[PDB]
């Protein structure tokens, strides 16, 4: 028996890692399961394309084709709609505002789903597991989940990260064996939606610090997932780190940055001496990663 807790700031991957704890250590998602997500899929997909639209009407961008302005007038109506969206997804234009997502709030899967629409409009569509992992739903108040692995009983707690939620965390603080803190690597240039004026990796650091170092967690295994490496690894190829860290003097490469960052985080340990941090680089959506890692992880706890 085993209290596990997952923490992080908002949209860091937590709830996805919970999803796999389940595909991994159980059967995963069924059809009738897959199917109840159908509807999220679709939700997500709409709100994303819309937010891009919307966004253009602020950033003032211009569709590729004048033609697409009906298709847009008519997205809203509305909400054959796939047609619309497809069609828009592919305006040169809209894709410029999508490449600018960080001047706004767009979900992360926003392209995964959009880019795969033919596949999931066709009626009689059933989500896959990745389809399902890639979905978004805000976690609030806290969800417990059980499972046994390697012959422990894990009791897993899943919270929300927006700040507004952090409020209710303390009620889960007793008795904790392990924590997995998730950080979105790709956050290095985004600001917080609760607070446009905060960098998101900044806020994450703060928090980490406050957990890593919290007096309840002193005999707790602190595990840090840095995550979204997929996404990082792309970003990093065209947005620069100096944005989070204006003093980075390296080059911007997955390799070099990931590590700077690996680092800025690991140094907020105030007991580098007494207390170790066990850090992994993650893709919550990759099932094969995570499962890999979470083996690592447990065989640590075993301590």
């Amino acid at each position: 028996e085993v209290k596990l807790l997952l923490l992080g700031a908002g949209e860091s991957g937590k709830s996805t890692i919970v999803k796999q704890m389940k595909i991994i250590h159980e059967a995963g998602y069924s059809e009738e399961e897959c199917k109840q997500y159908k509807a999220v899929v679709y939700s997500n997909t709409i709100q994303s394309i819309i937010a891009i639209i919307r966004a253009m009407g602020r950033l003032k961008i211009d569709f590729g084709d004048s033609a697409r302005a009906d298709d847009a007038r008519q997205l809203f109506v509305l909400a054959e709609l796939a047609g619309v969206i497809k069609r828009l997804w592919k305006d040169s234009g809209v894709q410029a505002c999508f490449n600018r997502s960080r001047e706004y709030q767009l979900n992360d899967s926003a392209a995964y789903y959009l880019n795969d629409l033919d596949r999931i409009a066709q009626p009689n569509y059933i989500p896959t597991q990745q389809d399902v992992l890639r979905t978004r739903v805000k976690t609030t108040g806290i969800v417990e989940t059980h499972f046994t692995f390697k012959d422990l009983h894990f009791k897993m707690f899943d919270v929300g990260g927006q700040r507004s939620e952090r409020k209710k965390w303390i009620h889960c603080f007793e008795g904790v064996t392990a924590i997995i803190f998730c950080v979105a690597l790709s956050d290095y240039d985004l600001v917080l939606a609760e607070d446009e004026e905060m960098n998101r990796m900044h806020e994450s650091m703060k928090l980490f610090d406050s957990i890593c170092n919290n007096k309840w967690f002193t005999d707790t295994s602190i595990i840090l997932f840095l995550n979204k490496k997929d996404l990082f690894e792309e970003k990093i190829k065209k947005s620069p780190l100096t944005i989070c860290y204006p003093e980075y003097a390296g080059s911007n490469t997955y390799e070099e940055a990931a590590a700077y960052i690996q680092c800025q985080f690991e140094d907020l340990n105030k007991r580098k001496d007494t207390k170790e941090i066990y850090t992994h680089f993650t893709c919550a959506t990759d099932t094969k990663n995570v499962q890999f890692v979470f083996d690592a992880v447990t065989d640590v706890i075993i301590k």
């Binding site: 952090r166 806020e203 928090l207 406050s210």
Partner: peptide
Amino acid sequence: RGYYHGIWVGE
């Protein structure tokens, strides 16, 4: 100010 019980929640 900023914290909630060791926890950083924001100003």
